[PDB]
């Protein structure tokens, strides 16, 4: 059965853990210990293929992190649409992933999370322009409502498959 190794990165509080828990448990967490970093497994069928997703939920700024980063096959780069700084921070995550992989062609999806909230300070167009400069998709998500969550993770799988 095919395994896909996914790594979820981004600034504190953007909803990395909430996105992962929503994907797996179909539940929205209001507060999740920000120090817990672990990998989680989910068996899914994607485009008729039974897949095992091995998802590293990163935390902090570690051996485990360095290990999945080096062997990680695709990256969700998450910001929150009500957190301008987290959007601005994306570039640091992408630059580090490129360094790790020594490549500018890394399977990656830009994720704008918390799209259920009204205090939007990052426009969709801004994030689209950033994603276009990186040559990657942009997808908006809400870990609260589940909007976009499956699309973000499964699109990352389809990006890994083009690689």
Ligand X SMILES: COc1ccc(-n2ncc(C(=O)NCCCS)c2C(F)(F)F)cc1
Ligand Y SMILES: Nc1nc2c(ncn2[C@@H]2O[C@H](COP(=O)(O)OP(=O)(O)O)[C@@H](O)[C@H]2O)c(=O)[nH]1
Interface residues toward Mg ion, by CB under 5 A:
17, 59
Does position 97 bind ligand Y by CB under 6 A?
A: no
Q: Quote the least distance from Cβ 138 to ligand X, whole Å.
A: 19
Letters for 94-123 (x = contact with ligand X by CB under 6 A, - = none) are: --xx--x-----------------------
β-pairing verdict for 2-10 and 49-57: parallel
- Contact pick of 52, 117, 121, 123 for ligand Y (by CB under 6 A): 117
Which CB sits closer to ligand X, 144 or 152? Answer: 152
Look up residue 31 and give its DSSP letter. Answer: -
If one counts every other C-beta atom within 10 angstroms of the C-beta of residue 84, the result is 13
| H, E, C per residue of 36-54 | CCEEEEEEEEECCEEEEEE
Instruction: State the nearest-atom distance from the C-beta of 47 to ligand Y, in Å.
Output: 26
CA–CA gap between residue 133 and residue 32 (Å, rounded): 33
80: three-class secondary structure by DSSP: strand
Residue 69 interacts with which of Mg ion, ligand X, ligand Y, none, CB < 5 to 8 Å by class: ligand X
Q: By the 8 A CB rule, do 139 and 110 touch?
A: yes
Site membership for ligand Y, residue 35 (CB under 6 A): no
- Give the binding site for ligand X (CB under 6 A): 7, 9, 58, 61, 65, 69, 72, 89, 92-93, 96-97, 100
């Amino acid at each position: 059965m095919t395994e896909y190794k996914l790594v979820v990165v981004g600034a504190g509080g953007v909803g990395k853990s909430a996105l992962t828990i929503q994907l797996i448990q179909n539940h929205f967490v209001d507060e999740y210990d920000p120090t817990i970093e672990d990998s989680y497994r989910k068996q899914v069928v994607i485009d008729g293929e039974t897949c095992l997703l091995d998802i590293l939920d990163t935390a902090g700024q570690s051996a485990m992190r360095d290990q999945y980063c080096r062997t990680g096959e695709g990256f969700l780069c998450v910001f929150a649409i009500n957190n301008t700084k987290s959007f601005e921070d994306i570039h640091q995550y992408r630059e580090q992933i490129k360094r790790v992989k020594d490549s500018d062609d890394v399977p990656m999806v830009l994720v704008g999370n918390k799209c259920d909230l009204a205090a939007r300070t990052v426009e969709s167009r801004q994030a689209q322009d950033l994603a276009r400069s990186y040559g990657i998709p942009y997808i908006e998500t809400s870990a609260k409502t589940r909007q976009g969550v499956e699309d973000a993770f499964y699109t990352l799988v389809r990006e890994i498959r083009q690689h």
